[PDB]
Amino acid sequence: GSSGSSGAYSELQMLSPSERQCVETVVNMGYSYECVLRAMKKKGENIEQILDYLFAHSGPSSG
């Protein structure tokens, strides 16, 4: 799912099924979209990772 050269941020608008779930997932866990988004593009594809990175920014609150 890619071809159009021009249009990067466009993805955000219509992310993929793997990215959407990633975001949504965490977003559901009780996180932000922007952060998660970045984290996702930072850590890539790996909730755990995104979580590890997220926590960093996020505050320590288990439960």
Structural contact between residues 26 and 54, judged by C-beta atoms closer than 8 angstroms? yes
CA distance linking residue 10 with residue 19, whole number of Å: 13
Q: CA–CA distance from 62 to each of 17, 29, 32, 33 (Å)? A: 28, 12, 17, 20
Find the helix packing angle between 17-30 and 33-43, rounded to 10°.
Answer: 130
32 burial (CB, 10 Å; 0-12 / 13-18 / 19+) is: middle
Which residue carries 């920014």 as its tokens? 57
CATH code of the region 1-63: 1.10.8.10
* Tokens linked to 26: 């965490």
* Tokens linked to 8: 């990067």
CA distance linking residue 60 with residue 57, whole number of Å: 9
Method for this entry: NMR
| DSSP secondary structure letters along 1-63 | ----SS-STHHHHT--HHHHHHHHHHHHHH--HHHHHHHHHHH-S-HHHHHHHHHHHS-----
